[PDB]
Design a protein around this nucleic acid. Sequence first.
RNA 1: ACGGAAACUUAAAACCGUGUUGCACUGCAACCCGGAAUUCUUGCACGUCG
Length: 296
Amino acid sequence: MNSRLFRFDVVRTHFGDHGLESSTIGCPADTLYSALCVEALRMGGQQLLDELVACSTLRLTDLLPYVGPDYLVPKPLKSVRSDSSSLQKKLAKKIGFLPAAQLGSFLDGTADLDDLAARQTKIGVHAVSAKAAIHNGKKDADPYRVGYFRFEPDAGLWLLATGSESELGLLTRLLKGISALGGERTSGFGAFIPTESEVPAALTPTTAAASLMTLTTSLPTDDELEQALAGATYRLVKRSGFVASATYAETPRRKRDIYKLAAGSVFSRPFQGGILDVSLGGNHPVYSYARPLFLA
RNA sequence: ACGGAAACUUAAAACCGUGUUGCACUGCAACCCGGAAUUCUUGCACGUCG
């Protein structure tokens, strides 16, 4: 199989975390794959979605930053051997990403920290944008304060995706026509242009090659969680949300509250990923992605 | 089936009100309308008497 390197031009975007006034640089793929099962009904016929409801034969990364020509792959959660001073102990957690090479030098306390943190403010700015609210009835309009992320003028988000090339060819069938991503996208946000380039082969999936660093907020099955946890350096998030879509036209309710693992986490053993489903009450299934992809 | 899907940073309010380009100032001081030209040169109160 090949893989696909996806270069964007994401100027402003808004992937919230717990509301709207904040943002995140990363899109954990249960947010991205859920778009691919709602921005496929707007092009297919609910047959393209039904072609890919619960197969998970396609492994795709998340939407991680890139500053110029180098992928800003995430800061892994491995125990650093910081035999140096305690300032650069604290300076690691103020660093979310790093380029594609320095990770092995990073993990043993043998790396720079005041250049990687100096390219944090080369990614882009955590902006805000005030707006004014509803004429609720006839009363006085409120504001609503909504905050975003803004990239630098030479950045965007990257993506690596592999699997069956027919169901990979239907990703790029969809993405050449997927509109403004992000959350608050009916305004000017999350708009971008997807371009194809040939991948870096320094980032192969090392599923068992003694580099068990993932590139996707993922999850194994519930039983096999007991196997891939003895040396897992992992963090837990929430991947909740709301549901209120056509063919589900009622009052808006939520997805089921899941907690996937981290996205650059390093483990003890290989594992498998599968499409968890988050529908709680109602008609059509809604489902989280959780199908990881690995790194040297 | 993206912590999504909807929303105006909006409605009114005069950079206005009091204020002279004004007050003192000769178009004034000095000079002749002044100097040389004959009202003149020709010229009879008379011719005329049985």
